[PDB]
Design a protein around this ligand. Structure first.
Ligand code: NAG
Ligand code: CU
Length: 217
């Protein structure tokens, strides 16, 4: 149970919801649990108001950004970050409503010694790279942890989500893809989401990250 309110950019941490759309769990810190629900995208407190209540952070392609939670990410889970071009601007509720989301980063559990080994449950932040070859322009950045401690039943996986509003400058000329939509990218049946992390099936090959392949340039 945690929010992701602080964008990390230029080597510094922004204020709560300065660049991140305030999410509906701002008090409860509870997760999104329905991947068919519009909340799976940016978890906004109010779809029509919250984007306009959010500033837009200017960052350069190739620079390191990230997200800090309001506490340590103590559930075991899978982390990801998606970008979408944001038209007319990152502070619009129209931004990212289409299938323009592409994955740029993930931090999955790894299957070693017959058990899943998860990223640290004592960190309260994640960082990753805006692709150097990313075209300059405005983007939504969606960062999530899919917490898997009770994910053995359908809808048991827990999504903790924050969307930052970006102005990317000094970019490249790449063509990002594959693109997906939120909602749309997840069904809830993925072997990385509908998963018993404690009793893995006998022929378990390894953790399969959900969603599309990463684009890094
Ligand atoms: C990061 O630094 C660049 C260059 O100094 C600046 O243009 C940009 O506005 C900064 N972004 C922030 C502080 O979010
Ligand atoms: Cu929790």
């Amino acid at each position: 149970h945690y929010t992701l309110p602080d964008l990390i950019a230029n080597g510094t941490v922004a204020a709560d919801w300065q660049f991140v759309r305030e999410t509906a769990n701002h008090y409860t810190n509870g997760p999104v649990t329905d991947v068919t629900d519009e909340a799976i995208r940016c978890y906004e407190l109010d779809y029509s108001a919250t984007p306009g209540e959010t500033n837009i952070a200017t960052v350069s392609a190739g620079s390191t950004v990230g997200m800090q939670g309001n506490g340590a990410f103590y559930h075991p889970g899978y982390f990801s970050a998606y970008l979408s071009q944001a038209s007319p601007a990152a502070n619009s509720p129209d931004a990212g409503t289409a299938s323009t989301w592409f994955k740029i980063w993930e931090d999955p559990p790894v299957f070693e010694n017959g058990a899943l080994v998860f990223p640290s449950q004592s960190i309260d932040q994640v960082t990753f790279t805006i692709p150097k070859n990313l075209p300059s322009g405005q983007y939504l950045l969606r960062t999530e942890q899919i917490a898997l401690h009770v994910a053995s039943t359908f809808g048991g996986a827990q999504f903790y989500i924050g969307c930052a509003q970006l102005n990317v400058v000094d970019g490249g000329s790449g063509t990002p893809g594959p693109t997906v939509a939120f909602p749309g990218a997840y069904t809830g049946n993925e072997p990385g989401i509908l998963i018993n992390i404690y009793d893995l099936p006998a022929g378990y090959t390894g953790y399969q990250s959900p969603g599309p392949a990463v684009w890094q340039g």
